[PDB]
Amino acid sequence: QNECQLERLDALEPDNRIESEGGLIETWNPNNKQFRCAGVALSRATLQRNALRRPYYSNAPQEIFIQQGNGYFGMVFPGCPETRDRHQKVNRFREGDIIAVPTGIVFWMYNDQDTPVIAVSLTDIRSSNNQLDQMPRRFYLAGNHEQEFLQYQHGNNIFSGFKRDFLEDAFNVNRHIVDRLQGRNEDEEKGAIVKVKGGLSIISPPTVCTAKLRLNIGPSSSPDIYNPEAGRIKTVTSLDLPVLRWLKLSAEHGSLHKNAMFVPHYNLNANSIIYALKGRARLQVVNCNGNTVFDGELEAGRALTVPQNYAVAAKSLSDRFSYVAFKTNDRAGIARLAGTSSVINNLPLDVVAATFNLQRNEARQLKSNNPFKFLVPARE
Amino acid sequence: NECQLERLDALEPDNRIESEGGLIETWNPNNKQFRCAGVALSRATLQRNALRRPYYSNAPQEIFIQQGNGYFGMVFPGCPETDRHQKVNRFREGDIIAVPTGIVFWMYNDQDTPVIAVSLTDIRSSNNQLDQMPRRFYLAGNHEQEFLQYQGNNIFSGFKRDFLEDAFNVNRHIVDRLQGRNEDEEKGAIVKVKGGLSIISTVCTAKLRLNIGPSSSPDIYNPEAGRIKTVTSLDLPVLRWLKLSAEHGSLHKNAMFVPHYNLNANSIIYALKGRARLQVVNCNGNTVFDGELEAGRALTVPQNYAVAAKSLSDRFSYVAFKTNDRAGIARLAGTSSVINNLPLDVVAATFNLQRNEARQLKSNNPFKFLVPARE
Amino acid sequence: QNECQLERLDALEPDNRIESEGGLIETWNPNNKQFRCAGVALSRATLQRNALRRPYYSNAPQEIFIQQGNGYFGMVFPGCPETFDRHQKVNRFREGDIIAVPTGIVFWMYNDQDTPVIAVSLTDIRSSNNQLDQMPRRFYLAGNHEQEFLQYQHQQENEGNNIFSGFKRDFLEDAFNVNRHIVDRLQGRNEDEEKGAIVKVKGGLSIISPTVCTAKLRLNIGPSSSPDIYNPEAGRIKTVTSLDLPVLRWLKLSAEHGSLHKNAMFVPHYNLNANSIIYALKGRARLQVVNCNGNTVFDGELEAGRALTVPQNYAVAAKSLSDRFSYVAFKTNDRAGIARLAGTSSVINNLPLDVVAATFNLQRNEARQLKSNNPFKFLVPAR
Incomplete structure (x- = not known):
């Protein structure tokens, strides 16, 4: 195993683009020997004006850098106190922020401004908190698109994998809602990032999961x-x-x-x-x-x-x-x-x-x- | 890509090993599902007056008492005692027992209801500095260890008798028994204690047990x-x-x-x-x-x-x-x-x-x- | 895998010797199942009288045992207070010393006496601070010799073999604010492979006998x-x-x-x-x-x-x-x-x-x- 016996490095560009309704996701190949040595995957998300980076989670930690733009983000930490209509803390992110997403934590981003958001994400595959393998994965709660890292392996959301009756009893909601849940009436093109019409009413008035999740550099x-x-x-x-x-x-x-x-x-x-x-x-x-x-x-x-x-x-x-x-x-x-x-x-x-x-x-x-x-x- | 599993299965043990006082069933650790998980699974059944003879392993164990009640002991090197020995405890149905890496562990059933204990060996543990194969090291007997098949017979048997004679300061006969020489290799890990046992019931104060x-x-x-x-x-x-x-x-x-x-x-x-x-x-x-x-x-x-x-x-x-x-x-x-x-x-x-x-x-x-x- | 299903173990002498001007570096082959299992590499350095183990760092922790001889040593911890020319602390080592060298820390040794120093090094590859691969690596600031574990790898204008030799002269000149001559020395352009990691110090050396880097780095056993x-x-x-x-x-x-x-x-x-x-x-x-x-x-x-x-x-x-x-x-x-x-x-x-x-x-x-x-x-x- 001489993964890090690197003879030649290259300045790398992403080798795949995945366009969605409200934005774009670009991936660098995790299989390239440079990234395998580093033990990481790299990706770049662009959110157009009024776009939602729909909730997803990964089997490894993420460090995200905001190259450009501002907005809102949320993380769902199992077992934390909330704020009819209850929910967890939505924070604002700012250009030049570093955002820390721990392993398995659901995370979402909203751009409520006119400047496109560009977020560059490092996925720490080598982390000891990743107990699967060295393939980067993303699990999407919703939609009917493939996750960006699928192409690099050898419905599509997690709800779509379950029987409808299971979901009906577990959520106690009607077949129609369940259909929505499993992204049935939706096609690959709507994708991971999605346009939002009326905006999103997210704001005021009102082990460490109350920890600070973001810092500006x-x-x-x-x-x-x-x-x-x-x-x-x-x-x-x-x-x-x-x-x-x-x-x-x-x-x-x-x-x-x-x-x-x-x-x-x-x-x-x-x-x-x-x-x-x-x-x-x-x-x-x-x-x-x-x-x-x-x-x-x-x-x-x-x-x-x-x-x-x-x-x-x-x-x-x-x-x-x-x-x-x-x-x-x-x-x-x-x-x-x-x-x-x-x-x-x-x-x-x-x-x-x-x-x-x-x-x-x-x-x-x-x-x-x-x-x-x-x-x-x-x-001089 | 060990966890790119496209098909899971409900798994049974693929091996049973009968011994004088019970049975040990093991699931195959080489199966892709357990390899992804980074673990191995086994099941021990102890009949009346059966002794799960002392053994250790190079990975953490978590043992769930599926059935029965009995006693267990663990040997923690460098720990005050309670003849003289370390703490013997009671376990009951529904107990979870925690056996740290390398610690010697033994179980005993003094009742009619067979004890059934299912064990999870955490191979992927950071505390396991060997490889991905489950291993158990038996202090005694003349049987193969449960996991050999997936790769005397006790640790003492691999040493010269002169070494053991001098290290313990005992005659050749004690060393012979120590080495499981005369034992028929069917007696195995779990042994019948003829007349039952003589019951007496960085931290050696730790609780090792908890009922769930x-x-x-x-x-x-x-x-x-x-x-x-x-x-x-x-x-x-x-x-x-x-x-x-x-x-x-x-x-x-x-x-x-x-x-x-x-x-x-x-x-x-x-x-x-x-x-x-x-x-x-x-x-x-x-x-x-x-x-x-x-x-x-x-x-x-x-x-x-x-x-x-x-x-x-x-x-x-x-x-x-x-x-x-x-x-x-x-x-x-x-x-x-x-x-x-x-x-x-x-x-x-x-x-x-x-x-x-x-x-x-x-x-x-x-x-x-x-x-x-x-409804 | 089963790097630890070992059915046989060997008592081994070092596998390879590398002679330098002022001493000798002996390595055990880290690809021996035995060492792959243990997750370590083993080496043995010999410093002759007035010999200098030139500064090198490693991508993994080292624990070093002084089998023979007495001398000085120094480490360089990024961002640490100094002493006195101004340098970091240089300590004495004695026979029986265990010297702890953390990952990435520059380390040097000098034999200021007559008896050859013999130091055996455990390099800990299984470490979590090692984020490369299973191969021991050593990085030399100076010289024109290969690093001693290179022979165990099996796989551009390049001359020397030190970290400076890989940079272009202008970067070095600018980086250090020094003339073409100094930079050439830095890159070891005019030194031959036979000189090695351990150098004879001509006039003898000139030094005196005196995240927590104020810590003790040595203890005799x-x-x-x-x-x-x-x-x-x-x-x-x-x-x-x-x-x-x-x-x-x-x-x-x-x-x-x-x-x-x-x-x-x-x-x-x-x-x-x-x-x-x-x-x-x-x-x-x-x-x-x-x-x-x-x-x-x-x-x-x-x-x-x-x-x-x-x-x-x-x-x-x-x-x-x-x-x-x-x-x-x-x-x-x-x-x-x-x-x-x-x-x-x-x-x-x-x-x-x-x-x-x-x-x-x-x-x-x-x-x-x-x-x-x-x-x-x-x-x-x-x-």
């Missing part, structure tokens, strides 16, 4: 690092969003000015899926044998898998390059290979000299000539 | 449907280490439990009495099981797969083992349901119903999990 | 330390767990150091919740290990320099044939638990006398002997 959050001449990095870990300890997931959001770069570095204990949000960058990632397994442009809308411990560096080719990196641990640590608090920095001067065969003077240069932590401004 | 049968306080009770009792790490903290739990269920004729799925666990449904109709559906709306589950058979329900059941007997009862200590069910109908906790409007839009139709979906059944028979 | 078990006629045992070295709780690793007088043995026993790698340090021993079918999967001599795997729940026993048999056993759990099959705190001792009688078909008085005749706990003296 956009421009209004406190950055981990901000360099007026290079950019900003903000990470969300389980210290910021405690429910992340259950999902064992985290994320990093980054922005780079033109011709600035982030220093070579690696992830101690996590795979990274880097998804390009805006612009283009030159990335290089190297493996344990000094090989250059990736060396090229990553443009908005594409993903690059960076395996744990593989070193990576990026240089922006655009006025701004922004990305969101999904990491398969809740306390993802990076080791900086260059810069203020880097590996060389924290090595005794002399061992630095004996390690790379440099005069003492050159070793000090290697240590201190670069005064910045993670970001380095472009030059 | 009728005599206990239920979690759900409906007079014209049945009852549910579940044991989790909340009820029995030691379960926190096994990462296992269990639900005992009873259904009156024509009553049912609502469509539902388990969030975070695989389930093995074992039928205790009577018959039921079960359906389970996968992620694509396909019916992977649609048929009868009678007493003495098991049905695998994978995580996130939905299951529904309707009793065909005056009383249908089952124990469901689950591969998580805090297993959460998500109810698809009834009181505390997914549909219930969606706002009225999203329900309306989701299935395309009028508000009042949605209202009915969320309210026409006010019972939690059990649904009573009709 | 050798002859200096206070024994958990001592028997004047049998030998001694010392173990380190997360209870001694709290950081072990992150690695899920522990280690047991043993030493037996001649003809002394340790009682048959099994590990509840850990696989063991027994590495022999001194003298020879007769070991037996039995599986779940009463079979002897190993039955011969374990002598200094060879490693043996005892899978979880397999019973093991040993009788020393040398004036002194000493060993270190690595176990895949920070809180390993053993069940002794014989001696005072034994599984048999904790069963009611009567079930013992009935279990083994013994008279009461014989069951009593089985409990009582051996007054010692784990070690037993020569009869």
Whole structure:
């Protein structure tokens, strides 16, 4: 099993599109060796104005990033206090939010605004909370469409699998309602995302399932690092969003000015899926044998898998390059290979000299000539 | 792709092993359903004055006492005692006993009613650092272990007698008996104790036992449907280490439990009495099981797969083992349901119903999990 | 699958040697069923006088035993306070030290004295912090040599083999703000494969003797330390767990150091919740290990320099044939638990006398002997 013996990486695009009445779902192939190594599946949902991402659940945790847009979402946590007509908390999500969906939790999204919502979802197949297999699955409560990850295997909602009489007794409702339930009078094209007519009256007035399910890593959050001449990095870990300890997931959001770069570095204990949000960058990632397994442009809308411990560096080719990196641990640590608090920095001067065969003077240069932590401004 | 199951079956044991004092039945762990589940299932019957001789396993065990009453002991390395020995306990019908990974366990029946104990070995456990094959290690006898067939005879027999002579400081005859040398390999795991036994009834204070049968306080009770009792790490903290739990269920004729799925666990449904109709559906709306589950058979329900059941007997009862200590069910109908906790409007839009139709979906059944028979 | 249905076990010397300028790295083949079952890799580094194990990191936890020699070592924990040039803390290590190296942490060693240092490393692949595959990997900051586990994989402008050599010079120049010359050195462009991971430090080195990264990273379990078990006629045992070295709780690793007088043995026993790698340090021993079918999967001599795997729940026993048999056993759990099959705190001792009688078909008085005749706990003296 050398799933992670990756010789060549590629900036990846989705290889399937699934259009529905009120939007679109795009999938990256989970079978590609990059994703299998990473142990994740990647997808991107677009909700048109007044569209509903109908309730579904998955057998693994999801970390979702809101690339664009705002709206409402709900999660159904079995055994939680409610708020005739009772229900669980509907929260608002905002552009640049990271939303945590634990395993098996039903989740839905509504766009009550004019800007299309773009949500990019990481499904943590490798999670220990996934007790099935390494195929990503989605279970839809409703409709008559295939779930996006079916095509990658070798009525369609969960109600459609049961006898009508079972459903009649269990719900104590008429054959007509049951028919609606099982999506009988509905066709594949209506799909996972659906147009809403009168809008949806969702709002006011009024173990941790009362936990915070979402955190913003956009421009209004406190950055981990901000360099007026290079950019900003903000990470969300389980210290910021405690429910992340259950999902064992985290994320990093980054922005780079033109011709600035982030220093070579690696992830101690996590795979990274880097998804390009805006612009283009030159990335290089190297493996344990000094090989250059990736060396090229990553443009908005594409993903690059960076395996744990593989070193990576990026240089922006655009006025701004922004990305969101999904990491398969809740306390993802990076080791900086260059810069203020880097590996060389924290090595005794002399061992630095004996390690790379440099005069003492050159070793000090290697240590201190670069005064910045993670970001380095472009030059003249 | 071990869990891309397109056909479930109601499974019987495919092997029976008779011994002087009883019988052990095993279900095939290589069967695709149990491999998806990450578990193995076995059933032990102890006659009057039968001793289930001490054994251990490299994975957690959860044992349900289907019938009878008796005694059991466990040996926890480095634990204060109570001759001198560790605690011997009583078990009764409907008990769930938790045996942690590697702990030596023995059972005894001192009554006429045969003890019947069904065991779930949690191979997929993080505490199992071997492989996917169930293993049991017997301290004694000269019989093969129940699961060998799916891949002297005791651990002592594999050592030189000189090693054992020096380690125990005893003569060659004691070591010979220790090694099961002269024992006929039909005596087996469960042994008759000629005159019965000499009864005396990070934490060694842990409760190892808990009753989930009728005599206990239920979690759900409906007079014209049945009852549910579940044991989790909340009820029995030691379960926190096994990462296992269990639900005992009873259904009156024509009553049912609502469509539902388990969030975070695989389930093995074992039928205790009577018959039921079960359906389970996968992620694509396909019916992977649609048929009868009678007493003495098991049905695998994978995580996130939905299951529904309707009793065909005056009383249908089952124990469901689950591969998580805090297993959460998500109810698809009834009181505390997914549909219930969606706002009225999203329900309306989701299935395309009028508000009042949605209202009915969320309210026409006010019972939690059990649904009573009709008329 | 059945990587642990082992019907035979081998006491193995390292499988391959890799010589460098200043020492030697010996690896056991991690594709041996034995190690695949255990979920670990085993290696042995030798540092000659004034030799430097150059900085490398791994995608899995390491537990390292100092078999021989004294020296310094250092780790680099991302985002940690410093000391003094400004660096992170460098510690001394002694014979018998267990050094805990967490996943991804850069680690280096220097032999500042004459006797060759010998450090044997358990790399814990089964770990959850390992998110790659079943293959041990090591990542070197410097040099132009292959990483020592590369030879066990069977499968672009590239020269050197270190992590910097894979980046283009401009990235490095920009990244470090240094000239073309320094960058070339970094990438090891002008160094040859034969120089290796362990380098001779010409003038000698210049260093002084001084998420919780302020934690203790080292603990001695050798002859200096206070024994958990001592028997004047049998030998001694010392173990380190997360209870001694709290950081072990992150690695899920522990280690047991043993030493037996001649003809002394340790009682048959099994590990509840850990696989063991027994590495022999001194003298020879007769070991037996039995599986779940009463079979002897190993039955011969374990002598200094060879490693043996005892899978979880397999019973093991040993009788020393040398004036002194000493060993270190690595176990895949920070809180390993053993069940002794014989001696005072034994599984048999904790069963009611009567079930013992009935279990083994013994008279009461014989069951009593089985409990009582051996007054010692784990070690037993020569009869």
